[PDB]
Design a binder for this molecule. Structure first.
Ligand code: AM7
Length: 268
């Protein structure tokens, strides 16, 4: 009962459920299941399937669909691909995504069994930068960039996907979100990596954050963070949006630091 022209625009994003199996008893965000998708050439592919249970009316479904149209257009190694969406007749809709072996980046860097070097963590920060560079080039604002929202596949390739302590100054006071506010959040993401998943601003409450920043207080330099990279963080946290670097400047800048380092436990 959605708009006919909108339904036609979405068809390329929709998966006929006749080609999807969802292992509802195999859980992986938080409602995420193992799935098996059958692609149009006959390819059986292993996916993660999330059920968007918070949907209800035509508006939300419409929003959801056009969001899907956008996400589906995005092709980049460092951006999580949407494989499709599934509109079930008797159940809330499903997002279908490629399976990511190593889950999200925050969990991966937090667990003590893993031992990423300084080069590894900068490397992970660099890949995020590349994906964000691409997203910005497509005039897409992320709004929710954080370590927890970046995925990590079998090749250790970081995928961007979608929070006051990550938000830019001008977003906290004006709910204004731009690619330059994404930059502020990417700076926080960098701090997250170089701390190996520490919680940002531990001793300041979610409401006292804005006055904290207006004092000039910033996240302290992480134990693992090289001085040139800490200066990159602070540029990302300048109050005037236009002063902050572009993601293209960040790819080129961070890459230069990355190249000075040797020793990787997780390559590519
Ligand atoms: C929970 O961990 C995983 C999560 C995975 C995953 O999560 C998701 C990421 C993004 C999205 C998502 C992406 N995009 C949108 C916007 C959108 C709006 C409208 C239309 C289309 C899209 N929305 C709304 C979304 O929800 C959904 C997800 F389910 C996707 C793929 N693979 C995953 C793999 C995982 O774990 C691998 C195993 C880890 N083990 C290892 C040993 O340690 C213990 C566990």
């Amino acid at each position: 009962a959605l708009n006919p022209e909108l339904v036609q625009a979405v068809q390329h994003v929709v998966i006929g459920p006749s080609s999807l199996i969802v292992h509802f008893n195999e859980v992986i965000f938080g409602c995420v299941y193992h799935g098996t998708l059958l692609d149009n050439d006959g390819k059986k592919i292993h996916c993660a399937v999330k059920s968007l249970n918070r949907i209800t009316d035509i508006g939300e479904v419409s929003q959801f669909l056009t969001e899907g149209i956008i996400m589906k257009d995005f092709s980049h190694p460092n951006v999580l691909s949407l494989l499709g969406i599934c509109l079930r007749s008797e159940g809330s809709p499903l997002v279908v995504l490629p399976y990511m072996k190593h889950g999200d980046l925050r969990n991966f860097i937090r667990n003590e069994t893993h031992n990423p070097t300084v080069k590894d963590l900068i490397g992970f920060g660099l890949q995020v930068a590349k994906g964000m560079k691409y997203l910005a080039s497509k005039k897409f604002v992320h709004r929710d960039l954080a370590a927890r929202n970046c995925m990590l596949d079998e090749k250790f390739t970081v995928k961007v996907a979608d929070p006051v302590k990550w938000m830019a100054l001008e977003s906290l006071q004006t709910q204004k979100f731009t690619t330059k506010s994404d930059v502020w959040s990417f700076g926080v993401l960098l701090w997250e990596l170089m701390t190996r998943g520490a919680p940002p601003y531990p001793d300041v409450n979610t409401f006292d954050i804005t006055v904290y920043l207006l004092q000039g207080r910033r996240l302290l330099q992480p134990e693992y963070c090289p001085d040139p990279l800490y200066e990159v963080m602070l540029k990302c946290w300048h109050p005037k949006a236009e002063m902050r670097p572009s993601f293209s400047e960040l790819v080129s800048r961070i890459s230069a630091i990355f190249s000075t380092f040797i020793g990787e436990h997780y390559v590519h």
